[PDB]
Amino acid sequence: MFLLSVFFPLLGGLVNTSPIARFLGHRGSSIIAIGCMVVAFISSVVIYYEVVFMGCAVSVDVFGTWFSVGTFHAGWTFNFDLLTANMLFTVTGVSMAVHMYACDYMRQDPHLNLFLGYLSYFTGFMCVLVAADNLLVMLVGWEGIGVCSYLLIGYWSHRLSAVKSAQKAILVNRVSDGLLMWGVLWVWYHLGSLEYDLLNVYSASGFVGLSILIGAMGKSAQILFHVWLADAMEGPTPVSALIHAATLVTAGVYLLVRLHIHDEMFVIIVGSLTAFMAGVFGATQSDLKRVIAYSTCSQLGYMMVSLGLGETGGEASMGHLMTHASFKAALFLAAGMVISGNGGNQHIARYGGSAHSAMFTMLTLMVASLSLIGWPELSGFYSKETILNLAAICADPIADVAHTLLLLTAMLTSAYTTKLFYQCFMVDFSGSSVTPVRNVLPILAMAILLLDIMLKVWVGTNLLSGMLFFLPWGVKTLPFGLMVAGILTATAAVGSERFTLIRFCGSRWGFDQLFARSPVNPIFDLGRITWAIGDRGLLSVGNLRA
Amino acid sequence: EAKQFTPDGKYMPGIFSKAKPLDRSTQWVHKNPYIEAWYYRRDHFENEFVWNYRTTIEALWFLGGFTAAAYALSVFAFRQADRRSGYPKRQILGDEPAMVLPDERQFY
Amino acid sequence: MASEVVLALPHKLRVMRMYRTGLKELINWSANRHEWYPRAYALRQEFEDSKALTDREEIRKKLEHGEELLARFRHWEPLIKPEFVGGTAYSINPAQPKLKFIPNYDAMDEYKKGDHL
Amino acid sequence: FSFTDATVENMRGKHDMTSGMVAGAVTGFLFGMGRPMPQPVAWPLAFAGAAVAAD
Amino acid sequence: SMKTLADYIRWRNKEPIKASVEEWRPPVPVINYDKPQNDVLSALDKDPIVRRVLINPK
Amino acid sequence: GAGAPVKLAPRPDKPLPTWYELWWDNGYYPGQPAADFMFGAWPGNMTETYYLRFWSVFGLALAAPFYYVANFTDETRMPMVPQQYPAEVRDVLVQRRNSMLKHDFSAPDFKEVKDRAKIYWTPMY
Amino acid sequence: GFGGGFLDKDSVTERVLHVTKHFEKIDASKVSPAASFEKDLGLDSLDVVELVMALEEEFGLEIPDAEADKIASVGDAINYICSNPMAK
Amino acid sequence: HGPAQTPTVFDKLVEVTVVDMNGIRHRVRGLQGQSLAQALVEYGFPDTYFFPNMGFYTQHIVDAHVFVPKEFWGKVQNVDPESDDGLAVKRMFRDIVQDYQRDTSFFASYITLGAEHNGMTVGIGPIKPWILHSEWAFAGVHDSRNKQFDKPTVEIW
Amino acid sequence: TSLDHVFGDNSNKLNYNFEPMGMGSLFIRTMVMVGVFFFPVFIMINDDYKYTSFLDKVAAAKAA
Ligand SMILES: CCCCCCCCCCCCCCCCCCCC(=O)O[C@H](COC(=O)CCCCCCCCCCCCCC)COP(=O)(O)OCCN
Ligand SMILES: CCCCCCCCCCCC(=O)SCCNC(=O)CCNC(=O)[C@H](O)C(C)(C)COP(=O)(O)O
């Protein structure tokens, strides 16, 4: 059962993209994709119960040695331990519902089986990433999900902005991939191996944690790397759900939790600044998918700070990752159903009422939104409150500012999520297209993720749930009051007259515009210099006329 | 509506035929004159080099500047490698007689 | 200040474009359409208070000030219907143009299908 | 050229390639004076290069 | 005056000649009011017209 | 709805600029710059001077509290010491520079453990 | 359905006549096809701006500004809408 | 395409009046796109009137010294005096013509016959003695009845 | 031109001269880019300087 969680989504992708799919068509390829995900989810459930609960890790030599020159030895080997089982359960369970949704959402697309094969490849490379036992097979998974993210973001290739969004995701992540590669070189040079179980670091040379942190900041879309994440909304809604829940953005946090070789000052500062920035960014957007994208960036900031706190903080970071994937995928699927019910419009000024959506879509948005804002005794309450209480008792003075930033971020999140519900359903109608979707497949796709939200409350992620870190009632129940403050403010729909702050925040602090000329235009101009002045000029040798 | 094959294979050239045969040049592009002119100009851009102010300044600060930066970095890396390996100062090109090539029979 | 296109317009069309863009920017800055209706009424009452003017200098000063206001309050995220330019559904799955086909190209003039030298 | 070479030779106290390069720069700048401008740099370079090739 | 090798070398000190011909420009969509804003603080934010048509209506 | 109409981009009918490869013409109207916001009007008509001017205040407004707590506040602000361990368990736990147990001011080797948690970059020889 | 992407003339005419009658000064009996906005109906320029914005709302269109300047009568609006493939 | 005229040779004919060095006027017919030196060769002029184009990779082209009136000065093709073709023309003026040069002096391979040359009158200019190799020279006197057209090859070696 | 009345025409042209950036702007932004993207080089140079000045202090106060 253990190799069935990794191979078999890759097999589904291989089937649906090869000339076998010429004989199946759309109708047969949908069956193949859904079955190939159901099998992998069943295998991951067995792996989860064996490794997490009964504590028996399994190591598999899959395809022998990859390459071995000198003392640099990379093998095709997996290891299934606690983190790997957690990640496999989360990835396969989310990707199954996203496949069941995409087989109905992209029904009218002309190349449906190609899209399903790309989704399966993306899932399989994520499984390869988390199942690897050494750094090089991890890099296979890293670049595989990067390539499949490029193929899926720029799926509608006749649209130029989608193509440029895919290229932007590739380039922004390529900077951090370079830094991560140099960090792998440092790690191997000063420890002698590439396998995770032999990488126990107490005191290393600083470049190790910094360069691995930069490589993780690329994929997890932290500060000065978040710019690709918002533009990745050019792709279809299943792509966004799988990018923001289970694949891609959770890979850097997984890598930092696995290695635990960071220096906590950088991690805490980057995470808290990212959380506050993405909180204020999502409060001032009107595109329905961009608000959810910025909430993803904000929660990744929370997890970054938590893994900065310590080993218990690393466990809480993995726990928040696991519970975040379910309600984030549910939020994106419900938003896709609302968009399709309103004629493709993504602006929240053109919604309202309870006619453009099913009852189940509204229930899904409500329950996932309540889990995200930390409503008591739902799924996100346990993990988010654990991170907040662990940040309130850290003995680092830097974590004092980080906790304040997290509390402000919590109020902002409960503001804009309540605004997303309020604009979508509570206000009067201001669109003109009412085509509500009530198909069986997307409704069952949403119901599965709501079942996982219930499961996280009933069965915890780890042993931290129910442990009491001893805090006064004032410190403990303040995030509930911040949630209520966000709800009351957003339902009052109040606004400020400070329009220059509004347009500074709504334009997202001008990061893209400043990047358009601080590295980008200089790279183009230095290329002009090296070609025209150097190759055609200073180094050019002419002819002798006679 | 040309016929370039007999019913049993056997390609026919159609040299004297009225209908236009499909062949290798069927999908050759129709040339835009301005695109051809721009590509010709970029192909011969060495005729446009001139030693004005901007050319001289950018060729000094970027080309010579980064070449000197890379030479300084290479010498820095060489010296630091020799220090972290237990070697004395070693003779690079133009550096007076010194040690080159460590002996394998020696412990450094 | 207006762009070089709007500055080339006749005076009637210049004022009409200013009123139209003001209504659209009020749509962009509002939360809903039901928020937008009384702001649209207020903008209409604002233009009605300068209808009976004759002095071209006062007209020019009011026109230029309003164009400065519209350049200031240009929304960074305008509301565009999805199937138009700048919308989210523009240029996704267009019908293919007619592409020509060459049947059995390898079988035409075999043994002579390389590059000349 | 010969006077500048021997002057830098006696001033620096040693025989090396610097005296030839300085003498070449001086002689080429004397040749290149009064000419349009690649030339007041190009001719010191040519005379210094002749000195360097000689060494 | 004196004849030298400097007369025979094609020195690269001649500026390339441009033409007054109008160059190609791609079409772009129209922006009706496109004055570049450099001021963080402006009196236009607190203009009475803005207060009358945006803030004050109920 | 596949097959929606889309407007085509015209071909060049005038002499081209020397550095024309900064426009992305994919065949449909409109084309774009090679990188967005490199030229043309920015969204909301803002400029680079606007963002740099607002950031010259806003950046120190965000870097101010971290500096204050990192230089004017220490471990003794906490009402309790870190989690206590037996010596055989603690002695390996505080070998990590990453650990939050080096902020235990009641430990007998508090200074020595803090002096061993200084970050270095070049490994010495 | 009907038409190669274009709405029929009669339903477009009915919808435009419905949109045009939403003024206080308008007498309903004068609203007909090929009726001028200013001379025949008695609407000023701001009323015409509002009418074209309402027709944009009615048919789900983003009418370009140069085209909206040319619309000056009911028949002009009907002929413009019947030439839109994107008119719903 | 319709009932328009069939192409005739008379549509592409160019007539040039040529005065040889004895003063005898000649009627020379050519075709559009043909150079002037080729039409002079095919008319039947003697081989002492012609000489190699003294460029690299073009000595197989025969050329003649012609006098062109001021009206047809702007229909001679342009040659850059800094290029290698310019140095070829400079070598021809330096070595073949010398002090027979006038302000109307050109070379006949640099004249491409078109409709603008129709009715143009040219004259053959004198040349100095020259040699390319042992099988192609000119001693200086135009006393030979051998036509240039009757030579089967133009030999650079 | 069959869709110009639906999506706009080609009359409005792009306002850009396709000219290189100014020399000072290019130099300043390149120096900032070198400082940001090559910060390990400056970190290691500072390490070498801080190490050799300590050995200078040792060699100074040792031979006295
Ligand atoms: C354009 C990009 C496309 C991307 C494609 C997907 C991504 C791929 C990324 C990784 C690619 C690795 C592929 C390796 C191929 C074989 C290498 C091993 C060769 C070999 O002889 O090894 C033996 C073969 O075993 C076996 O192979 C097992 C025996 C047969 C039983 C299982 C059959 C395979 C079923 C797979 C289903 C589909 C999965 C799709 C990946 C195993 O033994 P060893 O000598 O290594 O000994 C050690 C353990 N005994
Ligand atoms: C965010 C909010 C930004 C604010 C936007 C700017 C708001 C400022 C509005 C006030 C400024 C003005 O009135 S601008 C000055 C406008 N007034 C005039 O031009 C004098 C009247 N002259 C005429 O020719 C016509 O009546 C004419 C009205 C042009 C056409 O209407 P008709 O053809 O029917 O006749």
Side-chain angles (χ1 to χ4, degrees), chain C residues 11-12 15 18 43 46-47 50-51 53 59 62-63 66 69-70 73, chain E residues 49 53, chain G residues 44-45:
Chain C
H11 168 76
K12 158 161 161 308
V15 168
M18 176 176 165
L43 187 60
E46 187 72 28
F47 269 85
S50 283
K51 179 142 69 154
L53 260 66
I59 290 165
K62 273 175 183 277
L63 195 72
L69 276 185
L70 282 180
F73 276 74
Chain E
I49 303 181
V53 303
Chain G
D44 65 345
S45 291

PDB file of all heavy atoms in Angstrom, chain C residues 11-12 15 18 43 46-47 50-51 53 59 62-63 66 69-70 73, chain E residues 49 53, chain G residues 44-45, ligand 2:
ATOM      1  N   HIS C  11     -16.007  70.612 -27.075  1.00  0.00           N
ATOM      2  CA  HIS C  11     -16.326  70.980 -25.697  1.00  0.00           C
ATOM      3  C   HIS C  11     -17.501  70.176 -25.145  1.00  0.00           C
ATOM      4  O   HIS C  11     -17.459  69.715 -23.995  1.00  0.00           O
ATOM      5  CB  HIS C  11     -16.617  72.478 -25.624  1.00  0.00           C
ATOM      6  CG  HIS C  11     -17.221  72.914 -24.326  1.00  0.00           C
ATOM      7  ND1 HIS C  11     -16.483  73.045 -23.172  1.00  0.00           N
ATOM      8  CD2 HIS C  11     -18.494  73.236 -23.997  1.00  0.00           C
ATOM      9  CE1 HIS C  11     -17.272  73.438 -22.190  1.00  0.00           C
ATOM     10  NE2 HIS C  11     -18.498  73.560 -22.663  1.00  0.00           N
ATOM     11  N   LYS C  12     -18.541  69.980 -25.958  1.00  0.00           N
ATOM     12  CA  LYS C  12     -19.699  69.196 -25.537  1.00  0.00           C
ATOM     13  C   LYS C  12     -19.314  67.749 -25.245  1.00  0.00           C
ATOM     14  O   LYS C  12     -19.685  67.191 -24.206  1.00  0.00           O
ATOM     15  CB  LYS C  12     -20.781  69.260 -26.611  1.00  0.00           C
ATOM     16  CG  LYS C  12     -21.772  68.128 -26.555  1.00  0.00           C
ATOM     17  CD  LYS C  12     -23.035  68.456 -27.299  1.00  0.00           C
ATOM     18  CE  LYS C  12     -23.801  67.187 -27.615  1.00  0.00           C
ATOM     19  NZ  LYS C  12     -22.938  66.182 -28.292  1.00  0.00           N
ATOM     20  N   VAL C  15     -17.195  67.533 -21.972  1.00  0.00           N
ATOM     21  CA  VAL C  15     -18.002  67.534 -20.754  1.00  0.00           C
ATOM     22  C   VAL C  15     -18.746  66.210 -20.599  1.00  0.00           C
ATOM     23  O   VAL C  15     -18.868  65.675 -19.486  1.00  0.00           O
ATOM     24  CB  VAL C  15     -18.956  68.748 -20.756  1.00  0.00           C
ATOM     25  CG1 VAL C  15     -20.015  68.654 -19.659  1.00  0.00           C
ATOM     26  CG2 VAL C  15     -18.164  70.032 -20.595  1.00  0.00           C
ATOM     27  N   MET C  18     -16.384  63.628 -19.325  1.00  0.00           N
ATOM     28  CA  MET C  18     -16.099  63.879 -17.918  1.00  0.00           C
ATOM     29  C   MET C  18     -17.218  63.369 -17.011  1.00  0.00           C
ATOM     30  O   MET C  18     -16.951  62.722 -15.990  1.00  0.00           O
ATOM     31  CB  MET C  18     -15.836  65.366 -17.737  1.00  0.00           C
ATOM     32  CG  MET C  18     -15.613  65.827 -16.349  1.00  0.00           C
ATOM     33  SD  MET C  18     -15.220  67.567 -16.470  1.00  0.00           S
ATOM     34  CE  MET C  18     -15.447  68.035 -14.786  1.00  0.00           C
ATOM     35  N   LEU C  43     -23.691  63.450  -8.244  1.00  0.00           N
ATOM     36  CA  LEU C  43     -22.832  63.882  -9.345  1.00  0.00           C
ATOM     37  C   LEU C  43     -23.635  64.577 -10.438  1.00  0.00           C
ATOM     38  O   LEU C  43     -23.169  65.561 -11.020  1.00  0.00           O
ATOM     39  CB  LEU C  43     -22.063  62.696  -9.922  1.00  0.00           C
ATOM     40  CG  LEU C  43     -21.012  63.090 -10.958  1.00  0.00           C
ATOM     41  CD1 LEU C  43     -19.989  64.013 -10.339  1.00  0.00           C
ATOM     42  CD2 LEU C  43     -20.351  61.881 -11.558  1.00  0.00           C
ATOM     43  N   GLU C  46     -24.341  67.990  -9.342  1.00  0.00           N
ATOM     44  CA  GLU C  46     -23.126  68.795  -9.389  1.00  0.00           C
ATOM     45  C   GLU C  46     -22.908  69.395 -10.775  1.00  0.00           C
ATOM     46  O   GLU C  46     -22.399  70.513 -10.902  1.00  0.00           O
ATOM     47  CB  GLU C  46     -21.933  67.929  -8.987  1.00  0.00           C
ATOM     48  CG  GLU C  46     -20.623  68.656  -8.822  1.00  0.00           C
ATOM     49  CD  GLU C  46     -20.608  69.521  -7.580  1.00  0.00           C
ATOM     50  OE1 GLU C  46     -21.322  69.182  -6.617  1.00  0.00           O
ATOM     51  OE2 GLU C  46     -19.881  70.536  -7.563  1.00  0.00           O
ATOM     52  N   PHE C  47     -23.261  68.654 -11.829  1.00  0.00           N
ATOM     53  CA  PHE C  47     -23.092  69.152 -13.190  1.00  0.00           C
ATOM     54  C   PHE C  47     -24.179  70.152 -13.557  1.00  0.00           C
ATOM     55  O   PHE C  47     -23.941  71.055 -14.363  1.00  0.00           O
ATOM     56  CB  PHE C  47     -23.096  67.982 -14.172  1.00  0.00           C
ATOM     57  CG  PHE C  47     -21.735  67.425 -14.464  1.00  0.00           C
ATOM     58  CD1 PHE C  47     -21.174  66.477 -13.629  1.00  0.00           C
ATOM     59  CD2 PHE C  47     -21.024  67.833 -15.573  1.00  0.00           C
ATOM     60  CE1 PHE C  47     -19.921  65.955 -13.892  1.00  0.00           C
ATOM     61  CE2 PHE C  47     -19.775  67.310 -15.842  1.00  0.00           C
ATOM     62  CZ  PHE C  47     -19.225  66.372 -14.999  1.00  0.00           C
ATOM     63  N   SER C  50     -23.597  74.065 -13.067  1.00  0.00           N
ATOM     64  CA  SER C  50     -22.700  74.804 -13.944  1.00  0.00           C
ATOM     65  C   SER C  50     -23.224  74.841 -15.372  1.00  0.00           C
ATOM     66  O   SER C  50     -22.478  75.185 -16.291  1.00  0.00           O
ATOM     67  CB  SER C  50     -21.295  74.202 -13.912  1.00  0.00           C
ATOM     68  OG  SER C  50     -20.614  74.585 -12.735  1.00  0.00           O
ATOM     69  N   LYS C  51     -24.494  74.487 -15.569  1.00  0.00           N
ATOM     70  CA  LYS C  51     -25.053  74.394 -16.913  1.00  0.00           C
ATOM     71  C   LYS C  51     -25.255  75.771 -17.532  1.00  0.00           C
ATOM     72  O   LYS C  51     -25.017  75.961 -18.729  1.00  0.00           O
ATOM     73  CB  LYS C  51     -26.376  73.624 -16.864  1.00  0.00           C
ATOM     74  CG  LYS C  51     -27.074  73.481 -18.196  1.00  0.00           C
ATOM     75  CD  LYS C  51     -27.724  72.120 -18.342  1.00  0.00           C
ATOM     76  CE  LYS C  51     -28.902  71.961 -17.402  1.00  0.00           C
ATOM     77  NZ  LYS C  51     -29.892  70.984 -17.930  1.00  0.00           N
ATOM     78  N   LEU C  53     -23.699  78.610 -17.382  1.00  0.00           N
ATOM     79  CA  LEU C  53     -22.538  79.481 -17.419  1.00  0.00           C
ATOM     80  C   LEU C  53     -22.247  79.921 -18.850  1.00  0.00           C
ATOM     81  O   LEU C  53     -22.626  79.253 -19.813  1.00  0.00           O
ATOM     82  CB  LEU C  53     -21.320  78.769 -16.830  1.00  0.00           C
ATOM     83  CG  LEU C  53     -20.932  79.091 -15.385  1.00  0.00           C
ATOM     84  CD1 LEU C  53     -21.993  78.609 -14.414  1.00  0.00           C
ATOM     85  CD2 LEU C  53     -19.586  78.463 -15.054  1.00  0.00           C
ATOM     86  N   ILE C  59     -15.621  78.462 -17.084  1.00  0.00           N
ATOM     87  CA  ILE C  59     -15.865  77.128 -17.621  1.00  0.00           C
ATOM     88  C   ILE C  59     -14.565  76.341 -17.715  1.00  0.00           C
ATOM     89  O   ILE C  59     -14.507  75.167 -17.330  1.00  0.00           O
ATOM     90  CB  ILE C  59     -16.568  77.232 -18.987  1.00  0.00           C
ATOM     91  CG1 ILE C  59     -17.998  77.730 -18.814  1.00  0.00           C
ATOM     92  CG2 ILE C  59     -16.559  75.905 -19.715  1.00  0.00           C
ATOM     93  CD1 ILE C  59     -18.630  78.196 -20.098  1.00  0.00           C
ATOM     94  N   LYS C  62     -13.336  75.343 -14.095  1.00  0.00           N
ATOM     95  CA  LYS C  62     -14.112  74.232 -13.545  1.00  0.00           C
ATOM     96  C   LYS C  62     -13.819  72.920 -14.267  1.00  0.00           C
ATOM     97  O   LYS C  62     -13.675  71.870 -13.624  1.00  0.00           O
ATOM     98  CB  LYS C  62     -15.600  74.555 -13.605  1.00  0.00           C
ATOM     99  CG  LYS C  62     -16.098  75.316 -12.398  1.00  0.00           C
ATOM    100  CD  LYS C  62     -17.545  75.705 -12.564  1.00  0.00           C
ATOM    101  CE  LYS C  62     -18.033  76.538 -11.403  1.00  0.00           C
ATOM    102  NZ  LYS C  62     -18.433  75.696 -10.247  1.00  0.00           N
ATOM    103  N   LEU C  63     -13.701  72.970 -15.597  1.00  0.00           N
ATOM    104  CA  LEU C  63     -13.403  71.776 -16.380  1.00  0.00           C
ATOM    105  C   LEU C  63     -12.039  71.197 -16.028  1.00  0.00           C
ATOM    106  O   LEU C  63     -11.903  69.983 -15.831  1.00  0.00           O
ATOM    107  CB  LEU C  63     -13.476  72.128 -17.865  1.00  0.00           C
ATOM    108  CG  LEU C  63     -13.537  70.998 -18.882  1.00  0.00           C
ATOM    109  CD1 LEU C  63     -14.896  70.346 -18.831  1.00  0.00           C
ATOM    110  CD2 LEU C  63     -13.260  71.546 -20.262  1.00  0.00           C
ATOM    111  N   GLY C  66     -12.059  69.618 -12.493  1.00  0.00           N
ATOM    112  CA  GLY C  66     -12.706  68.316 -12.500  1.00  0.00           C
ATOM    113  C   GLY C  66     -11.880  67.234 -13.174  1.00  0.00           C
ATOM    114  O   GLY C  66     -11.888  66.077 -12.744  1.00  0.00           O
ATOM    115  N   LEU C  69      -9.377  66.150 -10.700  1.00  0.00           N
ATOM    116  CA  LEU C  69     -10.012  65.250  -9.741  1.00  0.00           C
ATOM    117  C   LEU C  69     -10.155  63.845 -10.309  1.00  0.00           C
ATOM    118  O   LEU C  69      -9.935  62.855  -9.601  1.00  0.00           O
ATOM    119  CB  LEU C  69     -11.383  65.785  -9.342  1.00  0.00           C
ATOM    120  CG  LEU C  69     -11.450  66.834  -8.236  1.00  0.00           C
ATOM    121  CD1 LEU C  69     -12.897  67.134  -7.921  1.00  0.00           C
ATOM    122  CD2 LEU C  69     -10.708  66.371  -7.012  1.00  0.00           C
ATOM    123  N   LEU C  70     -10.530  63.736 -11.584  1.00  0.00           N
ATOM    124  CA  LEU C  70     -10.692  62.417 -12.188  1.00  0.00           C
ATOM    125  C   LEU C  70      -9.357  61.728 -12.415  1.00  0.00           C
ATOM    126  O   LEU C  70      -9.294  60.497 -12.397  1.00  0.00           O
ATOM    127  CB  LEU C  70     -11.464  62.513 -13.502  1.00  0.00           C
ATOM    128  CG  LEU C  70     -12.972  62.676 -13.365  1.00  0.00           C
ATOM    129  CD1 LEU C  70     -13.605  62.750 -14.730  1.00  0.00           C
ATOM    130  CD2 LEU C  70     -13.571  61.552 -12.550  1.00  0.00           C
ATOM    131  N   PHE C  73      -8.591  60.381  -8.773  1.00  0.00           N
ATOM    132  CA  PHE C  73      -9.432  59.302  -8.268  1.00  0.00           C
ATOM    133  C   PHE C  73      -9.626  58.181  -9.283  1.00  0.00           C
ATOM    134  O   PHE C  73     -10.673  57.534  -9.289  1.00  0.00           O
ATOM    135  CB  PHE C  73     -10.789  59.848  -7.835  1.00  0.00           C
ATOM    136  CG  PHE C  73     -10.800  60.412  -6.444  1.00  0.00           C
ATOM    137  CD1 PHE C  73     -10.196  61.630  -6.176  1.00  0.00           C
ATOM    138  CD2 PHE C  73     -11.401  59.721  -5.407  1.00  0.00           C
ATOM    139  CE1 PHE C  73     -10.198  62.147  -4.899  1.00  0.00           C
ATOM    140  CE2 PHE C  73     -11.406  60.237  -4.131  1.00  0.00           C
ATOM    141  CZ  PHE C  73     -10.801  61.451  -3.877  1.00  0.00           C
TER     142      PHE C  73
ATOM    143  N   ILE E  49     -15.920  68.893  -3.853  1.00  0.00           N
ATOM    144  CA  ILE E  49     -16.679  68.096  -4.816  1.00  0.00           C
ATOM    145  C   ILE E  49     -16.677  66.624  -4.419  1.00  0.00           C
ATOM    146  O   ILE E  49     -17.712  65.946  -4.490  1.00  0.00           O
ATOM    147  CB  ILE E  49     -16.115  68.294  -6.236  1.00  0.00           C
ATOM    148  CG1 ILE E  49     -16.128  69.771  -6.622  1.00  0.00           C
ATOM    149  CG2 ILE E  49     -16.885  67.464  -7.248  1.00  0.00           C
ATOM    150  CD1 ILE E  49     -15.616  70.036  -8.009  1.00  0.00           C
ATOM    151  N   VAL E  53     -20.072  64.439  -3.517  1.00  0.00           N
ATOM    152  CA  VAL E  53     -20.606  63.346  -4.329  1.00  0.00           C
ATOM    153  C   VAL E  53     -20.191  61.953  -3.865  1.00  0.00           C
ATOM    154  O   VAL E  53     -20.739  60.967  -4.378  1.00  0.00           O
ATOM    155  CB  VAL E  53     -20.236  63.492  -5.823  1.00  0.00           C
ATOM    156  CG1 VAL E  53     -20.728  64.824  -6.370  1.00  0.00           C
ATOM    157  CG2 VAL E  53     -18.748  63.283  -6.044  1.00  0.00           C
TER     158      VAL E  53
ATOM    159  N   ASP G  44     -31.073  66.298 -22.780  1.00  0.00           N
ATOM    160  CA  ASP G  44     -29.820  67.020 -22.944  1.00  0.00           C
ATOM    161  C   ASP G  44     -28.677  66.013 -23.074  1.00  0.00           C
ATOM    162  O   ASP G  44     -28.898  64.814 -23.242  1.00  0.00           O
ATOM    163  CB  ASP G  44     -29.601  68.016 -21.802  1.00  0.00           C
ATOM    164  CG  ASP G  44     -29.429  67.360 -20.444  1.00  0.00           C
ATOM    165  OD1 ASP G  44     -29.734  66.172 -20.283  1.00  0.00           O
ATOM    166  OD2 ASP G  44     -28.975  68.054 -19.514  1.00  0.00           O
ATOM    167  N   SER G  45     -27.436  66.493 -22.977  1.00  0.00           N
ATOM    168  CA  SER G  45     -26.282  65.623 -23.177  1.00  0.00           C
ATOM    169  C   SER G  45     -26.072  64.675 -22.003  1.00  0.00           C
ATOM    170  O   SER G  45     -25.669  63.521 -22.195  1.00  0.00           O
ATOM    171  CB  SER G  45     -25.033  66.467 -23.406  1.00  0.00           C
ATOM    172  OG  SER G  45     -25.107  67.134 -24.646  1.00  0.00           O
TER     173      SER G  45
HETATM  174  C1  LIG J   2     -14.641  61.256  -7.907  1.00  0.00           C
HETATM  175  C2  LIG J   2     -15.371  62.529  -8.331  1.00  0.00           C
HETATM  176  C3  LIG J   2     -14.469  63.350  -9.244  1.00  0.00           C
HETATM  177  C4  LIG J   2     -15.153  64.656  -9.621  1.00  0.00           C
HETATM  178  C5  LIG J   2     -15.367  64.705 -11.130  1.00  0.00           C
HETATM  179  C6  LIG J   2     -15.552  66.144 -11.598  1.00  0.00           C
HETATM  180  C7  LIG J   2     -16.848  66.736 -11.072  1.00  0.00           C
HETATM  181  C8  LIG J   2     -16.846  68.236 -11.357  1.00  0.00           C
HETATM  182  C9  LIG J   2     -18.095  68.609 -12.139  1.00  0.00           C
HETATM  183  C10 LIG J   2     -18.282  70.125 -12.155  1.00  0.00           C
HETATM  184  C11 LIG J   2     -17.397  70.725 -13.241  1.00  0.00           C
HETATM  185  C12 LIG J   2     -18.233  71.170 -14.440  1.00  0.00           C
HETATM  186  O1  LIG J   2     -19.406  71.263 -14.344  1.00  0.00           O
HETATM  187  S1  LIG J   2     -17.418  71.560 -16.018  1.00  0.00           S
HETATM  188  C13 LIG J   2     -18.219  72.994 -16.797  1.00  0.00           C
HETATM  189  C14 LIG J   2     -19.518  72.557 -17.469  1.00  0.00           C
HETATM  190  N1  LIG J   2     -20.348  73.704 -17.801  1.00  0.00           N
HETATM  191  C15 LIG J   2     -20.279  74.270 -19.133  1.00  0.00           C
HETATM  192  O2  LIG J   2     -19.555  73.799 -19.936  1.00  0.00           O
HETATM  193  C16 LIG J   2     -21.145  75.462 -19.521  1.00  0.00           C
HETATM  194  C17 LIG J   2     -22.340  74.910 -20.277  1.00  0.00           C
HETATM  195  N2  LIG J   2     -22.029  74.859 -21.688  1.00  0.00           N
HETATM  196  C18 LIG J   2     -22.531  73.886 -22.658  1.00  0.00           C
HETATM  197  O3  LIG J   2     -22.161  74.020 -23.783  1.00  0.00           O
HETATM  198  C19 LIG J   2     -23.503  72.721 -22.372  1.00  0.00           C
HETATM  199  O4  LIG J   2     -24.598  73.094 -21.577  1.00  0.00           O
HETATM  200  C20 LIG J   2     -22.835  71.443 -21.828  1.00  0.00           C
HETATM  201  C21 LIG J   2     -23.146  71.264 -20.349  1.00  0.00           C
HETATM  202  C22 LIG J   2     -21.321  71.450 -22.010  1.00  0.00           C
HETATM  203  C23 LIG J   2     -23.398  70.249 -22.591  1.00  0.00           C
HETATM  204  O5  LIG J   2     -24.763  70.144 -22.325  1.00  0.00           O
HETATM  205  P1  LIG J   2     -25.810  70.109 -23.594  1.00  0.00           P
HETATM  206  O6  LIG J   2     -25.136  69.491 -24.790  1.00  0.00           O
HETATM  207  O7  LIG J   2     -27.007  69.286 -23.227  1.00  0.00           O
HETATM  208  O8  LIG J   2     -26.264  71.508 -23.930  1.00  0.00           O
END
